[PDB]
Amino acid sequence: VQLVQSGAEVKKPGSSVKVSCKASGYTFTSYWLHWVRQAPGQGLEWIGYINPRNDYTEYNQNFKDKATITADESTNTAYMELSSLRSEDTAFYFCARRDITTFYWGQGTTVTVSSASTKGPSVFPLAPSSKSTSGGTAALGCLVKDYFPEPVTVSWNSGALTSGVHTFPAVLQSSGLYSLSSVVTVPSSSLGTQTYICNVNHKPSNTKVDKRVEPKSC
Amino acid sequence: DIQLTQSPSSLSASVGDRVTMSCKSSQSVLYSANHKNYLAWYQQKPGKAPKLLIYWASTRESGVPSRFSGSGSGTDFTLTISSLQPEDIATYYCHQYLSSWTFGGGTKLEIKRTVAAPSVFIFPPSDEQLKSGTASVVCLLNNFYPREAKVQWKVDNALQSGNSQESVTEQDSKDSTYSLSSTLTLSKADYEKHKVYACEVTHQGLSSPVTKSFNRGEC
């Protein structure tokens, strides 16, 4: 008894996108199916709903020129289509239904609207030095710059190193390309006596890079 | 239609505290036919779907810890967390389903802890990026609390505007701190035009602003 939504979407402005929501383990026509939007860093906003039994639909006033909700009882699948995509349509989209006992939400679908095109990142070292040392603590990392779209995944020493590893949220540059830093906090004594390698993967561009981060002497 | 007002918008409390957040509707959500309040409370973690905690204002969801409880009827509702736990760092939403769905603005809950100044680190651009024709300087603020911090980039004591970007991690589940990473990006020719590169960090845990700096060519 779960709602399964289609995968992440990356779209150019002016295009359309149709996201799917498959319902399983219950009677599809017995309950209204709603769609809800969440822009980045924002709250939850209701889009509209469909009664799958008679295809009756009602929408939030703010989405009338944007969203079209449909359903197919024969496949037990609901759809929400967005027309003439613009940058402000970049958000999280959830389908949700209400039961007598509980609520069921889909896992969510991100829609990213951008004119940028797919590009693998460059992986540059963040070399440790006295400038990145405080007491018995040193910082080192990798700068993963100029990639599109999301996501990139970073492991350290092929997965053998997890303590002190934190990857920051990517930043969207004016170029429309993402940039991300992954750093590791290590004992200062390990600099020069321990090998640190960052493993970067960007699957949209089939990019796979292993960068050794070697200390600088300054 | 039926508006929902949540307060506070943010909450900071220590592990073990009792925490309450309120949701007030512009109209009553108590239905006359079944005397049920059409109000629900959700917990949402970043990147994830909202998780249902309470339905019909006071009925707790099956798997939800008994520390969560919902109270109120009509237009005034409260979600209570009896003993705040570290896994409760999230954004909480109220949701009325009597009429067409509307949501509260959310309550962002964080853990309160002893003030911790950031360790400040700076990284000069790599030889590989410079060969490519650009220079990015990274300033790192590690394990500070509270989240509010100011990072200013200065090139030869000139404050920089429009060439840097920062991002902050979610609050750490073990030590309740934040970390911040800021990248200043210049063209290689512009980088080679100046000597001193510094990030000035202001934070409540710092008696005075700290500067991490280097000179071009020294590393």
Residue numbers in the entry:
A (entry chain H): 2 to 52, 52A, 53 to 82, 82A, 82B, 82C, 83 to 99, 101 to 113, ...
B (entry chain L): 1 to 27, 27A, 27B, 27C, 27D, 27E, 27F, 28 to 94, ...
What does the article say, verbatim?
Our 2.0 Å resolution structure of unliganded epratuzumab Fab indicates that its paratope is largely pre-configured for binding its antigenic site (r.m.s.d. of 0.50 Å). Consequently, we next characterized the antigenic surface of CD22 recognized by two leading therapeutic antibodies in clinical trials: epratuzumab and pinatuzumab. Binding competition between epratuzumab and pinatuzumab revealed they recognize non-overlapping epitopes on CD22. Epratuzumab functions through an alternative mechanism, whereby it acts as a CD22 agonist causing prolonged B-cell inhibition, in addition to Fc-dependent receptor trogocytosis. Here, we show that epratuzumab is capable of binding to CD22 with high affinity in a range of pH’s, including acidic pH’s corresponding to early/sorting endosomes (pH 5.5–6.5) and late endosomes/lysosomes (pH 4.5–5.5)46.
